[PDB]
Design a protein around this ligand. Structure first.
Ligand SMILES: Nc1nc2c(ncn2[C@@H]2O[C@H](COP(=O)(O)OP(=O)(O)OP(=O)(O)O)[C@@H](O)[C@H]2O)c(=O)[nH]1
Ligand SMILES: Nc1nc2c(ncn2[C@@H]2O[C@H](COP(=O)(O)OP(=O)(O)OP(=O)(O)O)[C@@H](O)[C@H]2O)c(=O)[nH]1
Ligand SMILES: Nc1nc2c(ncn2[C@@H]2O[C@H](COP(=O)(O)OP(=O)(O)O)[C@@H](O)[C@H]2O)c(=O)[nH]1
Ligand SMILES: Nc1nc2c(ncn2[C@@H]2O[C@H](COP(=O)(O)OP(=O)(O)O)[C@@H](O)[C@H]2O)c(=O)[nH]1
Ligand SMILES: [Mg+2]
Ligand SMILES: [Mg+2]
Lengths: 426, 48, 428, 157, 426, 427
């Protein structure tokens, strides 16, 4: 009934979305060839949210892939579950932006963003009732940040009464791939604060720490991090696709998590995440999930919540459980660590339960928290931006193309006022 | 199910270790033959 | 995505002979040029059925080396029209090779590469090989890059030049040629990668432990570096970069483009048996002055930006940890402006081994490209000895007889002085 | 047979895995749970009934012990579950070297590059190429929007 | 209903705890694979005091191991019952303090103590109502003593309303391993008098004496001494794990044995302990168990009770016994040796009986007597401490790390006032 | 747990040759470099099926280095570990410290930096050198000082070989010993001396070897080092690592000088007759006849002692034996520390080596203590050093190397200050 399209920008977005589509296809019991092979009938009623009937059990994902380098498309298609995507949705340029926000927002955008706009429009009015849009992209790259952001702006100016999820990975000094990370990140966050309704802040350093400590992985390739993020997106939207004792769609979460329009940046965590050896000694109960949930090291962001306060929090649950245990556990976690929770908002936690757990686990949980501790990462990005901007390092590659300096001033001022109000509400 | 999947995992890892050890043992042999060929070429040079 | 490579001068086409040989053995293409009974598309354009021609031209003035390559093993490989050849050598004269012979030879190369690019569809850019010490690689090469810039401009041009070593030198008038070449290389080439000769000599004497090394090993290593930096374009990896990334990620200012290149691990056949290969020790090995492709001292300089090209079986977590550990160490220091002076990249396929070479097969290798201010000392050192001879008007009579004057010499000298001032101010 | 022989090869080498003993413990706990369901919530009755069930089976003729119980354990696991490059790169003989031979006395330096016979072990172990067939099948990048809107109104009522 | 957590420090503490867990698992009929194989249902109702339900009848000990050398972990895993511990509780450093109290209390503790408090909070919040905490270590080593001392301080400042048992092996000049024994012992006992609720004094010299005389062994390896200590620690907490005709929990014994808050050091004796040859010629009756209890050679400390006065005493009895026999025997042993008992406290013994004897023995008993005879060993170690500190021997290692002389002066002053009050109450 | 060994001097390389062959023999590693977790403290698992020692042999005369390069263990060591010079220091401390050292020490330091980079849990370093020679004295001090500059807090064990009083092979060795001690005072952390004539007496009396060569000496030195490091290598009933010697055997910051002992040194024939227990070997580890240093502990007072036990050893009887030793009045301790002992028990017995002269013994004891006999040894060396320096003999070589007389006087005064320290500690 409710419809969610998927948009993937850049190499990171394309790979993460490919893993996400693999996970959701497995969850609905459809084989990589594209035909239903599941057992439970419950999987059938809620696949119109992500798939379409083509020909006798043939399902095509409601996804749009956009990029500039054919290597990403070749990697997406070569792997398993790569033959399910419709080729018409492979909107695709040829030149390459290459870690340049100005290129991907002004040069290659003017000729490729119209085409992806037409594709996403054809995909949007094809269905009945739009619930929202789901966009996955990076923030350090060029074709993922700039083009994705301009797509966000165009879609928001087109469909303003339709929500929007954007999972964006952010740069860190510990995990720093490109050199222009602050220059792209500041403009991206400056444009996203007015356009995107809410985002899930992600970063590679926290994922590396999680897969080192909790998972105890020896060679955690990108596949494992993409698997964790795909599990995150599967958990966040599980309520639409399965019945539960207390349903909560994206709109319910957004209204229960956002107290003010600019306070829409969240940090996400997943549980359980147990090592291969300790899985046998573990217990499966709601208090264990809650304790592994509120752990500082379990968050998928490089922002310690112990350095700030929680404004609003949300937990999404899957599996056969008792509601009373959930409610009393949330009450206990609010009463014990009372300092970490904001004072002028009682019941800082919204809880929900779903009746269908993912296969391989009896009981799962997804945590989304809106704390003010995220301001430290914004300060960390802005100080690097100012340090590189004081002597105009790497500047003319943007200005020499059409970009201008007062927009950099606007972006840094927007970041400064956002972190100032974050500190205000602390 | 979880234990079976884990067991298959270390089985595959051990298979990879064995094949890599075999390849490492294989890669050694080529140098000596080239050495003798080079000595033969130098001997031809000095004789001429 | 395709890129064409041109080779100018005596050294450029030798480097190309090494490079194309490595490429052919890497893609499994026989020396004749046909498939024995898809990544090659960026270098080889498939002609007819089961036949490939490289996207390259070899141009030079003296025909001896050119027709020696013509009569070599790879006769059927290179297209006959591609191997451009002149009539008289410039004879280590920048003025001669830039104005006398260049006028009637650059047009043929220009309208040859024009149709070569017309054959292309996804042209990423260009990359040039030349030696600034000589005259052919300096004069007509600089003219050709100037005409390419006024022809395309926006398209990348990678300059892998060979400067004369401070103490090791084969020519005498080579400071003049280097200065005159740089006078246009500063404002014509987009990204340039620096390579000395004595540095490679020390690398092969110490690490590779060949006591009698010739130009063949040097060209083999240069080809290995080019293959390592291009395998991302040729082959897919977990995180690939194209030729455009060096335009932005490595250049801090429009006139500061001189990269320091290095490669690791430079190891012989027997040493690989003893040591263990992992990402941390090879990442460390890419930073000592003993593994630099340019004879200089990074200790006296500060790094503006760094790039890391990785090949083989390397996961991102451990290379990220190695980068973090390098950043924590205070032996090397970065510039006050850029805190994140790194640019990493991973490709799955390990570098290939050339039959008959001394480089052992390596599971994983690193190609490091950075930018420091030691080149600020290199240019000053070159300019001092340039002024030494120029003060007495030595060898100037040849150039003035060719047709030039003191004006271009003085303007190039003051341009180098201005470049020195830019380097010293950007260092602060 | 293949699984049994691989299994026996491992046990002789003391190769039993960590996941293996965890599986064995899990199977033992499952048997204990089944015995509890048989005899009620009391675990004492469960372990008892397990012991009399084990002792009730009549022994069969054997020549040795270790192999007997090893085969029994393997077959129990068997009932539980199942546990145990282009042609040019695979072969070098397909390509022809056909080099340009040169006079032994007169040898130029540039001739070294293309004169050496490759071997099987000189070839790479894996050739992870990229198939651009799907990208080539795509038309020119110059796309266009040419359509007439015919979307039916589906107001949320 | 009442739960006890276990904390072990250093090589000696880890091996003692390993033997303790082995003997407790054997007593409760738990196999080294964590499954139940016992015979009586009575072994199931009181295992929540030391175990947790993991997955369908899988039991994990409620223990946290902490130390600084990998050899300890390898030794724990090599032996039987070493695979029942949850690997998450294997908190572990990397460098090692190495017989340096200052190192293990200031340098290594500073970065490892956060993790051990995190894991102990994880373990404590798992159960409902804590009964007490148990720590096993020694006062001679540097790693175990300092880290356990600071951990006890952190627990006391975190949980001050819960009981605490600490077992410490204090060195003697006769059996003296390390040169820095007085320096570690003085500081550990200085911190223990204000933090630990009560302490259980153990000594290797007395263990050697009892295994030479009573057991008549020729090669008394550390296994035998650890087995004796493990039997003692099993006997002290037997009341919680099994019903009896006269119950006595840890809090009851602590309140009935400690007359003043600084008087919390006890000597240990256990019966029966006889040679295998002499076991055939011996009977099982309560007067004989009593005479083997009150023998001065049966105490496990280098402190002769006949050299001082008994302040309080306690006897823990296991097995279906006669209460009249018990209290008449205690009355007779008080009436006969009236000189050894304190004057201003009548009836200086607290007695208890349990109906479940240890496996293999029809009758057992444990003795915990608080007398003033222990002050002689305090002087015995403080005279060595003063002799070493008079000319500042082995001091620059402690001083060079950051701690100074006023700590030594405070520790020695506490020792002198403690021994003076022991003499005052004698 | 990782520790590396570096060998400076002609004697150091031979000592390393004995030690590493012993290590490979006990770990079952064939000389080619592969076996047919305990080895992790000495060997690095390189690639697959290859172990490389964590060691470097550095010297100036290449004869011994090339002899090792052409010996049986050609493929055991990584080739570029073996740093070799081009000209010897020729028993000249000034030459080995300022002439040749300034050009050869940097490469060794750049190597050990990478060696420690390969390590992750580095316990510390240990050095082997003979103070009599030039290379072992001159560049060794520079290497140690820049080691302390680079690391400082990591343990550096100095196993030196001091020249015998009446037995000597060189002439100007007092100068080298004095100038080496001047830096060894404040550079190394724990220092252990082992004289050569004492080993000669041990082998003459116990091993009854009438014509022994350096091979047996280095073999028993390797046995002592292996007994010392066995606790790190293998777990025991009572483990003791290398950090303990810092905090348990050094009473003063400037007094770090250990006397070593080993027991039982028993020949194969005598092994079949003498019954091995703990009491007799504990007694045997205290007489001067079982010392590797020619000194009389009776004239001195033991500040502290350390004991290493390997094999079939239980704590009860070793505690009984140490109690009996403490009750005995034939040996006196310092008035400061009453508990002047340190015991350690390891399960693995010492192994035998083919071609060696030791038997298969169930248990062994290695004793390390500290007395004032070091005070009389240093004084005895200083008298003959002053005899040398009174007439300015051989000083012209050092002067022409580039040195002067100031450092000689300051080293003599430092020795006098050390003698004052020993005599005031003995009070
Ligand atoms: N790396 C490398 N450099 C070379 C090689 N051959 C020559 N050079 C360099 O080229 C410089 C001189 O130029 P040449 O290569 O002799 O020829 P040229 O550059 O075309 O100049 P002309 O002689 O006037 O034609 C020397 O200083 C060398 O450093 C080579 O094979 N490899
Ligand atoms: N114990 C023992 N001492 C040795 C051995 N070899 C040499 N020495 C001692 O070392 C002293 C001289 O130093 P050497 O080891 O011979 O060589 P060096 O230390 O490098 O000094 P130079 O010979 O001057 O280069 C001699 O006086 C010997 O006492 C040995 O194999 N065992
Ligand atoms: N989780 C995950 N992150 C990735 C992956 N590949 C790249 N990234 C992240 O994406 C960032 C680079 O973005 P990039 O690919 O250049 O963006 P684009 O240029 O717009 O395509 C790096 O900081 C990486 O951390 C992946 O496979 N998985
Ligand atoms: N009961 C018992 N005591 C031991 C054992 N091992 C060592 N000890 C005692 O512990 C003391 C040594 O402590 P130490 O090992 O330095 O403490 P740690 O390093 O923190 O573990 C000695 O005095 C021994 O008497 C053992 O296995 N059992
Ligand atoms: Mg030329
Ligand atoms: Mg020598």
């Amino acid at each position: 009934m409710r419809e969610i399209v998927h948009i993937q920008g850049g190499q990171c977005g394309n790979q993460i979305g490919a893993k996400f589509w693999e996970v959701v296809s497995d969850e609905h019991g459809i084989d990589p060839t594209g035909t239903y092979h599941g057992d439970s009938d419950l999987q059938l009623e809620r696949i119109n949210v992500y798939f379409n009937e083509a020909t006798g059990g043939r399902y095509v994902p409601r996804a749009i892939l956009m990029d500039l380098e054919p290597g990403t498309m070749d990697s997406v298609r070569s792997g398993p579950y790569g033959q399910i995507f419709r080729p018409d949705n492979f909107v695709f340029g040829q030149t390459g932006a290459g870690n340049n926000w100005a290129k991907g927002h002004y040069t290659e955008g003017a000729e490729l963003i119209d085409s992806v706009l037409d594709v996403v429009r054809k995909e949007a009015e094809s269905c009945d009732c739009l619930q929202g849009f789901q966009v996955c992209h990076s923030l350090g790259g060029g074709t993922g940040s700039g083009m994705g952001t301009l797509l966000i702006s165009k879609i928001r100016e087109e469909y303003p009464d339709r929500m929007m999820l954007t999972f964006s990975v952010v740069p860190s000094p510990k995990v720093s791939d490109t050199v222009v990370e602050p220059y792209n990140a500041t403009l991206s966050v400056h444009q996203l604060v007015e356009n995107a309704d809410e985002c899930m802040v992600l970063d590679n350093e926290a994922l590396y720490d999680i897969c080192f400590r909790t998972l105890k992985l020896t060679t955690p390739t990108f596949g494992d991090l993409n698997h964790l993020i795909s599990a995150v997106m599967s958990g966040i939207t599980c309520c639409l696709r399965f019945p539960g004792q207390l349903n909560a769609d994206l709109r319910k979460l957004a209204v229960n998590l956002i107290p003010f329009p600019r306070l829409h940046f969240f940090m996400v965590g997943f549980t359980p995440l147990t090592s291969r050896g300790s899985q046998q000694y573990r217990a499966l109960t709601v208090p264990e999930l809650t304790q592994q949930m509120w752990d500082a090291k379990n968050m998928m962001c490089a922002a310690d919540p112990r350095h700030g306060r929680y404004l609003t929090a949300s937990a999404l649950f899957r599996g056969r459980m008792s509601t009373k245990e959930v409610d009393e556990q949330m009450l206990n976690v609010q009463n014990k660590n009372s300092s970490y929770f904001v004072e002028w908002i009682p019941n800082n936690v919204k809880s929900s339960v779903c009746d269908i757990p993912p296969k391989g686990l009896k009981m799962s949980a997804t945590f989304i928290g809106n704390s003010t501790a995220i301001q430290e990462m914004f300060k960390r990005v802005s100080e690097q931006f100012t340090a590189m901007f004081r002597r105009k390092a790497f500047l003319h590659w943007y200005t020499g193309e059409g970009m201008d300096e007062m927009e950099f001033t606007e972006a840094e001022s927007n970041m400064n006022d956002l972190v100032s109000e974050y500190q205000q509400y602390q | 199910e979880a234990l079976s999947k884990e067991a298959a995992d270390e089985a595959a890892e051990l298979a990879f270790r064995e094949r890599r050890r075999e390849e490492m043992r294989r890669y050694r042999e080529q140098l000596a033959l080239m050495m003798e060929k080079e000595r033969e070429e130098t001997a031809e040079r000095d004789a001429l | 995505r395709e890129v064409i490579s041109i080779h100018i001068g005596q050294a450029g086409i030798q480097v190309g002979n090494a490079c194309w040989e490595l490429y052919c053995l890497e893609h499994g293409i026989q020396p004749d040029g046909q498939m024995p009974s898809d990544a090659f598309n960026t270098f080889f354009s498939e002609t007819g059925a089961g036949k490939h021609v490289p996207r390259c031209i070899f141009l030079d003035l003296e025909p001896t080396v050119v027709d020696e390559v013509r009569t070599g093993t790879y006769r059927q490989l290179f297209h006959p029209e591609q191997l451009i050849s002149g009539k008289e050598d410039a004879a280590n004269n920048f003025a001669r090779g830039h104005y006398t012979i260049g006028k009637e030879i650059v047009d043929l190369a220009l309208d040859r590469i024009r149709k070569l690019a017309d054959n292309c569809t996804g042209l990423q850019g260009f990359l040039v090989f030349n030696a600034v010490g000589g005259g052919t690689g300096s004069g007509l090469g600089s003219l050709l890059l100037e005409r390419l810039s006024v022809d395309y401009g926006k398209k990348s041009k990678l300059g892998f030049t060979v400067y004369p070593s401070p103490q090791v030198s084969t020519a005498v008038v080579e400071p003049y040629n280097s200065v005159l070449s740089t006078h246009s290389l500063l404002e014509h080439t987009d990204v340039a990668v620096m390579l000395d000769n004595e540095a490679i000599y020390d690398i092969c004497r110490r690490s590779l432990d060949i006591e009698r090394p010739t130009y063949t090993n040097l060209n083999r290593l240069i080809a290995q570096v080019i293959s390592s930096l291009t395998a991302s374009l040729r082959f897919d990896g977990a995180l690939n970069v194209d030729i455009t990334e060096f335009q932005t990620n490595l250049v801090p200012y429009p006139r500061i483009h001189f990269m320091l290149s290095s490669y690791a691990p430079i190891i012989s056949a027997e040493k690989a048996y003893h040591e263990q290969l992992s990402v941390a020790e090879i990442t460390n090995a890419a930073f000592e002055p003993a593994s630099m492709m340019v004879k200089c001292d990074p200790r006296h300089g500060k790094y503006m930006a760094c790039c890391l090209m990785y090949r083989g079986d390397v996961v991102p977590k451990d290379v990220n940890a190695s980068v973090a550990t390098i950043k924590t160490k205070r032996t090397i220091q970065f510039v006050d402006w850029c805190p994140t002076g790194f640019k990493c990249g991973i490709n799955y396929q390990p570098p290939t081994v050339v039959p008959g070479g001394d480089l052992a097969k390596v599971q994983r290798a690193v190609c490091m490209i950075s930018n420091s201010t030691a080149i600020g000392e290199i240019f000053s050192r070159l300019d001092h000895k340039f002024d030494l001879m120029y003060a007495k008007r030595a060898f100037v009579h040849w150039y003035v007889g060719e047709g030039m004057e003191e004006g271009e010499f003085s303007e190039a000298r003051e341009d180098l002085a201005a470049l020195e001032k830019d380097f010293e101010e950007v260092g602060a | 047979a293949s699984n049994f022989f691989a299994y026996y090869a491992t046990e002789k080498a003391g190769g039993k895995g960590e996941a293996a003993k965890a599986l064995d413990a899990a199977r033992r706990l499952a048997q204990l749970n089944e015995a509890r369901t048989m005899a009620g919530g009391s675990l004492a009755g469960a372990v008892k009934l397990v012991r009399e069930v084990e002792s009730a089976r009549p022994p069969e003729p054997c020549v040795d012990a270790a192999q007997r119980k090893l085969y029994n354990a393997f077959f129990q696991s068997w009932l539980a579950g199942d546990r145990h490059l282009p042609l040019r790169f695979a072969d070098v003989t397909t390509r022809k070297h056909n080099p340009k031979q040169q006079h032994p006395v007169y040898q130029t330096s540039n001739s070294i590059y293309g004169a050496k016979a490759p071997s099987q072990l000189d070839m790479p172990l894996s050739y992870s190429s990229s198939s651009q067939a799907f990208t080539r099948a795509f038309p020119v990048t110059a796309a266009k929007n040419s359509c007439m809107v015919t979307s039916v109104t589906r107001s949320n009522v």
